[PDB]
Amino acid sequence: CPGCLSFGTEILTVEYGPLPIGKIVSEEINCSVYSVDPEGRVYTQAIAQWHDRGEQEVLEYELEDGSVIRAASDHRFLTTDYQLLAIEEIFARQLDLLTLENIKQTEEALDNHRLPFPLLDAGTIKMVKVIGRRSLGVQRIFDIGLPQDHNFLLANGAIAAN
């Protein structure tokens, strides 16, 4: 599973705040995530499918802002130019990840505006590079199915594909 994330990957949920994808899938939690459309606007959508994909090769990617992403080398994330590329590629080409700097402040703003709302008007964006990685072997992976755009915001501000 290319678009799978490790158990502990924290997804920013509307109703409960950050929750590990493994928990969301293991309990098949009905909740919504924050996603970005092709026009770069943020909106919420409820999870439609919960997938427990067993195990596969997972790497730990260390980000410039200190956060970390544990996923398959080819998992895609949103870049500063609005391209969904494999994190390994983002590391290899030293591209910048388009991320939200302050989650709390961003969610607060989105609570007082009509959605979808421009991601850049929601909060301050930070362009962070992926500085390194290291194999973790084969680990437990999961994925959630969304009804609209196949991406969602992580607790660290990064936007992961699905």
Q: Go through the domains of the chain in sequence order and give each one's CATH number.
A: 1-162 (2.170.16.10)
Q: Cite the beta strand spans of 47-147 per DSSP E.
A: 49-63, 68-71, 76-78, 84-86, 96-100, 117-118, 125-145
Write the CA distances from 75 to 1, 98, 107, 113, integer angstroms.
Answer: 9, 15, 25, 31
Q: Which amino acid appears at position 82 of this protein? A: Y
Rounded Cα gap, residues 36 and 161, in angstroms: 10
- The vertex-120 CA angle with 119 and 122, nearest 5°, equals 65
Asked if 9 contacts 19 with a C-beta cutoff of 8 angstroms, the reply is no
